[PDB]
Amino acid sequence: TTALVCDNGSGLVKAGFAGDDAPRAVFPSIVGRPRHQGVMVGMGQKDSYVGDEAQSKRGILTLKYPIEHGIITNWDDMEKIWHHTFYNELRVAPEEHPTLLTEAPLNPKANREKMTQIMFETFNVPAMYVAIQAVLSLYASGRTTGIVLDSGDGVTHNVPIYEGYALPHAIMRLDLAGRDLTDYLMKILTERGYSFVTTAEREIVRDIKEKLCYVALDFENEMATAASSSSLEKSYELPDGQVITIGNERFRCPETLFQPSFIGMESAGIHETTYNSIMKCDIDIRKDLYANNVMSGGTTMYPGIADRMQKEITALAPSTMKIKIIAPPERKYSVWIGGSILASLSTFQQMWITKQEYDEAGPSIVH
Amino acid sequence: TTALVCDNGSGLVKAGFAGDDAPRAVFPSIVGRPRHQGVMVGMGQKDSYVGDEAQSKRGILTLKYPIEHGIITNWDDMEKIWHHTFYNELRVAPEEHPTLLTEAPLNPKANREKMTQIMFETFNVPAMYVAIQAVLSLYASGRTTGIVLDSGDGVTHNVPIYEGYALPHAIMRLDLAGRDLTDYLMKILTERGYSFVTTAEREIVRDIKEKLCYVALDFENEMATAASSSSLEKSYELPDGQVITIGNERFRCPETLFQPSFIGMESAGIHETTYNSIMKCDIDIRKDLYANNVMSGGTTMYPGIADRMQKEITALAPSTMKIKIIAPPERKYSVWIGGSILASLSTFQQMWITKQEYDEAGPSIVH
Amino acid sequence: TTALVCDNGSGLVKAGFAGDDAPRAVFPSIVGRPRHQGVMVGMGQKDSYVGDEAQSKRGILTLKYPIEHGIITNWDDMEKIWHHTFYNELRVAPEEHPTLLTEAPLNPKANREKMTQIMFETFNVPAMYVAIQAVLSLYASGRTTGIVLDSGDGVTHNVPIYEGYALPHAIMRLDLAGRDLTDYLMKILTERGYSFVTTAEREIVRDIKEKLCYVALDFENEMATAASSSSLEKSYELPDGQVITIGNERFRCPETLFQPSFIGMESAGIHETTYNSIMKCDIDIRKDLYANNVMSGGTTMYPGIADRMQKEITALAPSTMKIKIIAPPERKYSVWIGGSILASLSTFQQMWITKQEYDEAGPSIVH
């Protein structure tokens, strides 16, 4: 009966049936093989633990994310993510639900084909559709115009949409955030003697990326007050007992979003990719792209944005033009709240790929 | 029919069929040749007396323990231990029982090979398995995680196990206790004029190590109250008639377990080997190694432990972490209660070495 | 007058004035307190012996290396290393020489500050500079491009440099070798019954790490010929009289450099850190990083490298690309031969920290 909205997270895969409030299942997408000798012999141990149990059994496994730089690294682990989610989380049969899957707008072909093809032949869903994650965040936002920011660990994208069409030549992909923000945080916590070399401990770094980080209002003046003796230093507690005190680096790591030079990436910041995508759109349409800048995803939830993002864009943009930055409550579930609206509406249900069409055309003509 | 659990004591060899309550036979493992001229001529005297009769015929023999510093000194005496136990104690035929043998985790190779090989070719058992003594104490404990302490006269070991695998690089071997505690007790009883120079009399020292010793709560303050006129002095009775009054040295000898400098050993105490083995294990796993410290063996049965061990570890360990020291009732039979659980369970019975495999591979591939 | 190049060894501190051939003084960096009771009463004994005399007075002391995991453990012993070297080895006055000190590229802050600050305030040098050990090995190598390997007991590093700039986001630190290779050698010599438990005896293990070890060409086939009766076994002689015969473990211990799983470290081998640091550098620059792989330090002097290192990298690297592994004669003095070239050249002498600047800025602005 009911359609299923399953979002192919970069993080953080999100799953829930059509409507209403939020995804029913969210989990960190990890598969982990056992890296220690089995001498206990109980045995009772699984061949590979998936999440969430692989986030409660850290250090006895070696966590490997299955999606890396926005591409699925191997479909052997990906299929196990899917199977684990459908059977032992959601508890639904594939033959009972038409599904809805997500992708990234600037991702290589035939990665959507191979995906679509494997999911139809392995799980035998009765119908399917694959949406780019940015378009769904417009439905979630409830605006009919604007530039969409889907930023997750680790693929960001910048898609401009105007009432009610998209401009093909204006889409910008930054590989700037967020797994590289995790790795950069791990490199600048070494500056205060906190060395987290192992795979498992890298998750702890990610947890400090959630809770303790913030973004500055003005870099130079936050760097100034960091030099002062005042308490920028916040004390985190670690599962083994250690108390970790981080200062400067706490606001330094997210600031990378405005200066990619810090992480050593040549590309221009969110600051400039916003401006340069708007100034690749037609003159008349720019008037309503200003004041319809819509952020989304989990990596836009740091405290110091959006009024940093606002002040930076407003400084580079032409004088005497109104700029408002639209940032929804609960951006982490934005894409999913999109998907729910889509699959419930008539009539584009009948633009979904159905099994009869798949039998005829296979991976051809997916576009 | 029934499998036999036979524990290769360092002491104190322990033997009993599979299940249930306790080993059927325990004995001090001594062989003794006759050190006096035979002029009685009855004769009727055995070429060498084994225990228990060699502990009732002391002084007419020279007792020689067959396992010394955790290694079997010669298999000529060891084979006589085995033969004596199977035939004139247990009263079982070797061809009727699959056996279960024990070893130490950090013991030289090919001492397990040579053992396995001699026992298969001499006693012709139909199947065999050799377990390290620490792993069996986990089965006895009924916990799935924790650091294991097998301390017997005279090899201790410290093995960390986490659900349900072992960490290879964290095993610590101290040669600190217990035959050196016997020898140290013999050296500090000389301080009160009790000189026990002969081999036989050394057993009497060992008996005073059992009954009269205790461990302090705080060394410095027990040393203080020893200087006081109050009765720390306890009167032991000796088989010849002598009444021996020991004071300070009564709590001094076990304290060596926390300060190896007293016996002149360079290595760090149980205090520090516990901490340093935990801080060689992964950060996430340390959280559940704290509060799963499991003691075992006969030399952990002194009265003043475990709350000395507790207070000392709790002082060196990081602040705000829960530490409980798990010390079973009847630790002297712990290993054996382990072995019983192992050989009764399916399926690792079919990971035992069988005669057909021994015919094919011999001492090769025992690992 | 003349500047002094003093290399802050992890081993093995190296010292010599500016130019020409080799360091004038090399020594094992040990401080040792006396672990036995002083009953001889001559007396004439020093409070603590430093090396070299602490390597001729082993067993009466407890040797403690002052640098542990690449960090200075306490500056009380470090200052005594420095004082001993300058006064009773080199025989130079601190006020007479501008000095040159070394560090590690991925080492916590403020460990270079605290060092610089203590050495300026304690020894009152008229000028100072602190170089990372890898950059100096490029000057020694005489190449203008390439990835630098500084591997000493016990911090390795992997720094890529291209004509004539460095790439910040490509530096990799492995804590894989070499004190852990010493400890691993001590753990696998126990497999042949050679138990070297004490601190002093650990030096003897280190000496067998120098002389008798080798690296395999192909692991699986060297493991095969080890199973054969052919003489891989080499006989070492020990200062007490013992003749030690080691076989398999002789080539097993260095092989850890290609498989960190053996020592239980989660990180990827030199094999993969070489490849993964090159494939984090820009596409155009990789062409000349291939064939400019430059090794350095004392722990790269084992016999079986570099043609193992070559064959392993050449197998993982893309097809049809020339790979040469540059390994200098006398790699143990490489860093120092670097330092000599640096301090002799104009003009970056005037980028050294001078006393006037230290008076003004102190430990601030060392970077």
Residue numbers in the entry:
A (entry chain C), B (entry chain E), C (entry chain D): 5 to 371
Would you copy out the relevant sentences from the publication that reported this structure?
In this study, we focus on the MD of myosin VI, an unconventional myosin motor unique in its ability to walk ‘backwards’ towards actin filament pointed ends. Here we present cryo-EM reconstructions of myosin VI bound to F-actin in the rigor state at 4.6 Å resolution and the ADP state at 5.5 Å resolution along with corresponding atomistic models. Finally, by comparing the conformation of actin in the myosin VI-bound ADP and rigor state structures to bare filaments, we find that actin structural deformations accompany motor conformational changes during the force-generation cycle.
As we expected actin conformational changes to be subtle, we obtained a reconstruction of F-actin alone at 5.5 Å (right), as well as a corresponding MDFF model to control for error in micrograph pixel size calibration and differences in processing procedures with previously reported structures. The myosin-bound density maps were then aligned in the reference frame of the actin-alone reconstruction, followed by re-docking of the corresponding MDFF models, a procedure which we found revealed regular patterns of actin protomer rearrangements which were masked when the MDFF models were superimposed based on the Cα coordinates of individual actin subunits (data not shown). Despite this preservation of filament architecture, the actin protomer adopts a unique conformation in each of the three states, with local deformations occurring at the actomyosin interface mediated by the D loop and, intriguingly, at distal lateral contacts in the interior of the filament mediating the interaction between the two strands of the actin filament. Consistent with what has previously been reported for myosin IIC and IE, this flexible loop also shifts upon myosin VI binding, orienting slightly towards the MD. Both the ADP and rigor states exhibit excursions of the D-loop relative to the unbound state, with a Cα RMSD of 1.0 Å in both cases. The Cα RMSD between the ADP and rigor states is also of a similar magnitude (0.9 Å), demonstrating that the D-loop adopts distinct conformational states as the myosin force generation cycle proceeds. Unexpectedly, myosin VI engagement shifts the H-plug towards the two actins located on the opposite strand, with an increasing deviation of position from the unbound actin state as the motor proceeds from the ADP state (Cα RMSD 0.9 Å) to rigor (Cα RMSD 1.6 Å). As we observe the conformation of the H-plug becomes increasingly deformed as the motor proceeds from ADP to rigor, with increasing RMSD relative to the ground-state of unbound actin, we speculate that this segment is adopting an increasingly unfavorable conformation as the binding affinity of the actomyosin interface increases, suggesting strain energy may be stored in the filament as the force generation cycle proceeds.
